[PDB]
From Swiss-Prot:
Changing residue 10 to A: No longer confers phiA2 resistance, not toxic in E.coli. It holds the Pfam family ToxN_toxin. This is Endoribonuclease ToxN. It is an enzyme of class 3 (hydrolase). Toxic component of a type III toxin-antitoxin (TA) system. An endoribonuclease which is active independently of the ribosome, cleaving between the second and third A of AAA(U/G) sequences, although not all occurrences of this tetranucleotide are cleaved. Digests many mRNA species, including its own transcript and its cognate antitoxin RNA ToxI. ToxI has 5.5 nearly identical 36 nucleotide-long repeats (a single repeat neutralizes the toxin in vivo); a single repeat folds into a pseudoknot which binds the toxin. The TA system protects P.atrosepticum strain 1043 against phage phiM1 and phiA2, E.coli against some but not all coliphages and S.marcescens against some bacteriophages, causing an abortive infection (Abi phenotype). Also protects P.atrosepticum strain 1043 against phage phiTE; phage that escape Abi and grow in this bacterium have evolved a pseudo-ToxI RNA by expanding a pre-existing sequence similar to the bona fide ToxI repeats. The gene is toxN. Changing residue 142 to A: Still confers phiA2 resistance, toxic in E.coli. GO terms for biological process: defense response to virus; negative regulation of DNA-templated transcription; plasmid maintenance. InterPro entries: ToxN/AbiQ_toxin (IPR025911), Type_III_TA_endoRNase (IPR053735). It comes from Pectobacterium atrosepticum. Changing residue 20 to E: No longer confers phiA2 resistance, not toxic in E.coli. Changing residue 64 to A: Still confers phiA2 resistance, toxic in E.coli. Changing residue 33 to A: No longer confers phiM1 or phiS61 resistance, not toxic in E.coli. Disruption phenotype: Loss of resistance to phage phiM1 and phiA2.
RNA sequence: AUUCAGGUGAUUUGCUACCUUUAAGUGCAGCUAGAA
């Protein structure tokens, strides 16, 4: 798994079908909204899932929740690092997506945080792929709401631009 | 941005574990000190 960004035009396109697809453009954003890399690959679809910085309501989400994978520094549980917002993962196409360039990124606190996350994610990368698969299944069966319409997105995301 | 999926313990507060391939109750607190 790796960090990605997603072209604004592609986010805009999907937003047309499901208004829950994560926002890309925002003036509060210091860095681009970062997505986490191939969280689930099934039936030809590859999903990326948006990372999100900590909010107040995060304390209430259970570790067992299918909607989020809470992130923290390896072996320092009190160093919370936001969460992978699985409920808003989206299918992608290689063309409209590009890896963060960690190689050439100047050393900033942000880059340092990126690496604390990368390690925790890599370490728990089976759990994360397993939550995703289950979350998708429940949504497709109608048992869960509040998420991206996977069934719909999976039907339209390959058209673009026609 | 998008402000908590449902379920598993002859019992179960909180968190955690577990299971959603129709399967699943572990751990630490909590309360407890009962009698074959």
């Amino acid at each position: 798994m790796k960090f990605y960004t997603i072209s604004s035009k592609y986010i805009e396109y999907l937003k047309e079908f499901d208004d829950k697809v994560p926002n890309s453009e925002d003036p509060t954003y210091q860095n681009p909204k970062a997505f986490i890399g191939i969280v689930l690959e099934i039936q030809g679809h590859k999903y990326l899932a948006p990372l999100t910085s900590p909010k107040k309501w995060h304390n209430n989400v259970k570790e067992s929740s299918l909607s989020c994978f809470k992130l923290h520094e390896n072996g320092v549980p009190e160093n919370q690092l936001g969460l992978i917002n699985l409920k808003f993962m989206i299918p992608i196409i290689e063309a409209e997506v590009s890896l963060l360039d960690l190689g050439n990124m100047p050393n900033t606190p942000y880059k340092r945080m990126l690496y604390k996350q990368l390690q925790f994610i890599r370490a728990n990368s089976d759990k994360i792929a397993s939550k995703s698969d289950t979350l998708r299944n429940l949504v497709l069966q109608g048992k869960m709401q509040g998420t991206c319409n996977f069934s719909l997105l999976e039907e339209k995301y390959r058209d673009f631009g026609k």
